[PDB]
Amino acid sequence: HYVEPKFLNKAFEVALKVQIIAGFDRGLVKWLRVHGRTLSTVQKKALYFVNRRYMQTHWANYMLWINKKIDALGRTPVVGDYTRLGAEIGRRIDMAYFYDFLKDKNMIPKYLPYMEEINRMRPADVPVKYM
Numbered sequence: 629h630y631v632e633p634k635f636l637n638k639a640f641e642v643a644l645k646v647q648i649i650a651g652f653d654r655g656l657v658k659w660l661r662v663h664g665r666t667l668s669t670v671q672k673k674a675l676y677f678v679n680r681r682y683m684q685t686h687w688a689n690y691m692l693w694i695n696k697k698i699d700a701l702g703r704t705p706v707v708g709d710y711t712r713l714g715a716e717i718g719r720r721i722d723m724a725y726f727y728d729f730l731k732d733k734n735m736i737p738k739y740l741p742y743m744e745e746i747n748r749m750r751p752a753d754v755p756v757k758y759m
Contacts, residue, residue, distance in 0.1 A: 651718020
């Protein structure tokens, strides 16, 4: 009974997703200090979804960057390495530039059921694709 290996250990994947989404969300909260009163509830929820979809579509590039670093470790990788790298991604990407773009150009997505489903997931469970 064969089993397919995950392409990244579940605990490492979870640490990345939790830290990335937490960091993107924190910057959204700060941006909403100024812009929350000029956006509807469904626009704000759509921006939370934007954070998750952004992670999903950039995941392959993140895996290249993460693996380049991990490959260069002269020791066994551990979960804390992934917490750290995920926190770096989640904090360094200044997502406010993108929120400003969407708001200014009237491209905040219409909030749909699929987006609500993604938003209601635990960050640990947001689907990512390796292949």
